[PDB]
Amino acid sequence: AMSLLTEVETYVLSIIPSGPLKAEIAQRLEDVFAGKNTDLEVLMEWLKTRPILSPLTKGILGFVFTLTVPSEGLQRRRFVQNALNGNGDPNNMDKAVKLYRKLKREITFHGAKEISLSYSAGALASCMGLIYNRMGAVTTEVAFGLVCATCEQIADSQ
Amino acid sequence: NAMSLLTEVETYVLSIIPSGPLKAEIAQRLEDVFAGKNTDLEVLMEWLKTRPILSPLTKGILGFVFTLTVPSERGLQRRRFVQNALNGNGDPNNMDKAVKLYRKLKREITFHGAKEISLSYSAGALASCMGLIYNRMGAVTTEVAFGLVCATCEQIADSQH
Numbered sequence: 001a002m003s004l005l006t007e008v009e010t011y012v013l014s015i016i017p018s019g020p021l022k023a024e025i026a027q028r029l030e031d032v033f034a035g036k037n038t039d040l041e042v043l044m045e046w047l048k049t050r051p052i053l054s055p056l057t058k059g060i061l062g063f064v065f066t067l068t069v070p071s072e073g074l075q076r077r078r079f080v081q082n083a084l085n086g087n088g089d090p091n092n093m094d095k096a097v098k099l100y101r102k103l104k105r106e107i108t109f110h111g112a113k114e115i116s117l118s119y120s121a122g123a124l125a126s127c128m129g130l131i132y133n134r135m136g137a138v139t140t141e142v143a144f145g146l147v148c149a150t151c152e153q154i155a156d157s158q
Numbered sequence: 159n160a161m162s163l164l165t166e167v168e169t170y171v172l173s174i175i176p177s178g179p180l181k182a183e184i185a186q187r188l189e190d191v192f193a194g195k196n197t198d199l200e201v202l203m204e205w206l207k208t209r210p211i212l213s214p215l216t217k218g219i220l221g222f223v224f225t226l227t228v229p230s231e232r233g234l235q236r237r238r239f240v241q242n243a244l245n246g247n248g249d250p251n252n253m254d255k256a257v258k259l260y261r262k263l264k265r266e267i268t269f270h271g272a273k274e275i276s277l278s279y280s281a282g283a284l285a286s287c288m289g290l291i292y293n294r295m296g297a298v299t300t301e302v303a304f305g306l307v308c309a310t311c312e313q314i315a316d317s318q319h
């Protein structure tokens with residue numbers, strides 16, 4: 001049986017350049033997956049201030065940490081909101097809403113990833129944005145599927 | 159922001175609030191903000207969040223109005239109680255329509271034009287469009303945001319009769 005978490009980790013790491021920072025991110029991801037005690041606020045502040053990572057990468061990681069910690073009332077973060085929002089283009093948003101409509105009916109990781117791969121990186125990031133901003137809701141496995149598809153599209157373009 | 163515009167927004171927003179002491183307190187805080195007094199947004203949003211009586215939707219609309227009218231947010235993160243109230247219940251049809259309205263509001267320049275176009279849409283679509291803007295997904299001018307707010311209040315008020 002696929003470990004969702006191994007898979008998410010592999011996809012998210014695929015968009016991060018090699019180096020000490022990448023090793024530190026892998027470790028924090030694993031710590032969170034395994035339930036090792038963690039202040040989400042502290043982790044998000046650490047993430048926000050890392051050099052090297054592009055804003056989109058920080059947004060994707062912030063989304064992953066927020067979804068995986070047992071509990072947040074931490075308000076959603078502006079640095080994630082700005083990275084996932086698109087540049088306010090109605091066409092990406094329109095496509096993000098169309099993908100959301102489909103993801104809302106899904107409950108499995110594989111179903112979610114497959115459907116998500118029909119959309120561009122921009123539409124995928126905005127769909128992540130919809131979810132992060134509480135505009136739409138999906139199950140955790142479906143959110144992970146979307147994350148992986150987003151990373152796969154980013155990795156393939158690079 | 160013209161006081162003319164602010165006063166119109168005040169009237170539309172107050173039209174969806176039931177009479178009583180709470181309504182008088184809201185009118186007063188709105189007016190204080192319009193004049194540049196008691197403008198700490200964090201305090202105001204925490205006050206709003208904990209008021210009894212007001213429905214979550216009303217709190218969302220007021221939260222959006224305070225956020226747009228204070229001189230600065232002072233880096234205040236956007237609020238969960240507003241985000242949950244202005245999302246059209248996460249319904250894809252409401253969201254789809256919200257995006258279509260947004261595309262039009264992005265070309266509008268006047269309050270009246272923003273309100274008129276917004277009145278063609280349902281309350282659900284309007285609340286989600288407000289959500290789009292509050293969540294930083296789309297951007298419109300302040301006068302256009304006010305037009306949208308007023309249309310939303312008008313649709314809500316009209317269903318109440």
Ligand SMILES: [Cl-]
Binds near residue numbers: 048077078079080
């Ligand atoms: Cl932030």
Ligand SMILES: [Cl-]
Binds near residue numbers: 237238239
């Ligand atoms: Cl809140």
Ligand SMILES: [Cl-]
Binds near residue numbers: 249250251252
């Ligand atoms: Cl629908």
